Amino acid sequence: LTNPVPLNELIARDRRQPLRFALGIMDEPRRHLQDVWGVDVSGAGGNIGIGGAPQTGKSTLLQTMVMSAAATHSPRNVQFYCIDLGGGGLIYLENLPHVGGVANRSEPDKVNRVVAEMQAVMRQRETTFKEHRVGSIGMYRQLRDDPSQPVASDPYGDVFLIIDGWPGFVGEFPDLEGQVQDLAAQGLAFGVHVIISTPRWTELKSRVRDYLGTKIEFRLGDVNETQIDRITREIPANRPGRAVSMEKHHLMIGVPRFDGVHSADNLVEAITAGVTQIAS
Ligand SMILES: Nc1ncnc2c1ncn2[C@@H]1O[C@H](COP(=O)(O)OP(=O)(O)OP(=O)(O)O)[C@@H](O)[C@H]1O
Ligand SMILES: [Mg+2]
Numbered sequence: 001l002t003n004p005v006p007l008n009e010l011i012a013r014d015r016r017q018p019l020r021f022a023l024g025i026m027d028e029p030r031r032h033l034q035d036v037w038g039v040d041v042s043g044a045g046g047n048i049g050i051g052g053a054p055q056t057g058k059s060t061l062l063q064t065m066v067m068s069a070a071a072t073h074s075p076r077n078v079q080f081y082c083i084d085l086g087g088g089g090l091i092y093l094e095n096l097p098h099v100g101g102v103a104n105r106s107e108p109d110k111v112n113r114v115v116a117e118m119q120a121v122m123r124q125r126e127t128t129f130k131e132h133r134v135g136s137i138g139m140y141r142q143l144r145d146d147p148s149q150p151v152a153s154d155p156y157g158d159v160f161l162i163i164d165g166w167p168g169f170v171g172e173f174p175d176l177e178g179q180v181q182d183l184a185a186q187g188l189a190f191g192v193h194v195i196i197s198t199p200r201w202t203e204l205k206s207r208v209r210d211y212l213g214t215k216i217e218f219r220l221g222d223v224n225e226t227q228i229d230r231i232t233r234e235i236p237a238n239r240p241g242r243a244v245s246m247e248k249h250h251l252m253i254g255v256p257r258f259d260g261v262h263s264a265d266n267l268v269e270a271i272t273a274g275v276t277q278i279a280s
Contacts, residue, residue: 001025001034001252004241007068007274008258010036018042018141019078019158021068023061024241024253037251038068041158042138045214046188049204050197051227052218057240058197059089060264061216062164063256063271065195066090070098071258071278077141077157081114085172086164086197092271096278105172115176118161118183118192125190128154137191158191166198177208184211201227216251218243240264 005025013035014022019042026037039045050058062082069078075097082102084090094102100117103110125140132151134140137158143149144157161183163169170177184194185207196212198204202225215227219235219242226232231244241253241264255263257270258277 001027002239003262004252004255004264006255006257006260006262007064007071008260010254011068011071014038016072018073021065021072022254023064023068024243024251026247027250027252029249037245037249039065039214041160041193041214044188046158046193047184047212048193048195048214048216049201049209049212049227050195050216050218051201051204051220052197052199052243053221054199055240056218057243057253058199058218059086059164060241060256060267061243061253062086062162062195062197063089063093063267064254066093066096066099066162067256067258067271067274067278070096070275073098076155077144078160079156079158080160080162081118082162082164083111083114083169084164085168090162090164092268093275095272095275108172111173112176114161115173115179115183118159118187119179121156121159122183122187122190122192125192129190137189140191156191158193160193160195163194163196166196167200167203181208181211184208201225214246216243216245 010022020038020040022036022038024037025034027034052058066080078098080099082090084102084104090102093099103114143151217228217232223233228244231248235242243251258274
């Protein structure tokens with residue numbers, strides 16, 4: 001599809017599910033139908049890897065993901081921490097109560113504090129789950145919905161670390177790579193998630209990439225480097241927002257706006273209007 005669907009229409013057309021974030025439109029070609037596509041982050045799809053050549057729509061998808069999550073979940077249950085090294089676009093998400101912080105190049109201390117905070121949660125969750133005899137993240141999410149449970153005082157729910165621009169991240173923060181690897185491989189059992197974009201899959205090493213259970217792939221510089229399959233060869237050139245994912249169906253990512261406008265024009269202004277509208 002060429003014109004992106006705005007989030008207000010995607011949310012409205014979607015059958016909502018806890019920890020389902022609607023993201024765009026999936027062409028399901030056997031029958032002629034085109035439904036709302038999203039990600040289930042409640043289980044093994046909880047970590048997400050995003051690949052694609054320059055200007056293909058990686059940062060916009062992250063904006064759409066966070067806005068979509070924030071429009072359909074409470075800030076008590078979903079929190080995002082953002083490391084923005086992919087164009088600066090994540091800053092316009094920071095006034096959402098779901099977003100605990102957006103860190104960029106101009107404040108390296110915050111990039112370090114953000115990773116350290118994700119580690120603190122996962123590492124507190126490990127002790128908490130044992131001491132409170134919590135059998136699974138699924139059970140932990142239920143217990144937190146009961147205000148009489150000791151665990152319900154945890155202000156955190158499912159916590160997502162977003163890294164837009166992996167090679168620049170490892171390039172400027174080499175010692176944080178190992179900490180993020182540990183979050184990706186151990187976090188999901190404790191409700192700690194990792195979401196990473198990269199221009200090339202080869203720059204996102206196995207030991208991290210293998211723990212991103214949902215891969216989303218825009219048009220690649222080298223189709224031989226796909227993390228999906230040969231379907232990626234079908235993505236049209238110069239169509240930002242066109243992607244493929246694990247179900248091997250073409251996708252058109254929607255836009256992070258709520259004003260009914262089917263384009264990515266004037267998006268900075270529309271994102272803020274969306275955040276305001278989400279305040280409901
Ligand atoms: N889902 C979409 N629908 C329509 N147009 C889009 C979509 N996503 C992105 N675009 C257009 O493509 C442009 C580049 O998008 P974006 O900044 O998301 O690319 P990127 O993958 O983050 O690139 P880079 O690696 O250079 O940061 C956007 O400014 C927007 O105008
Ligand atoms: Mg970008």
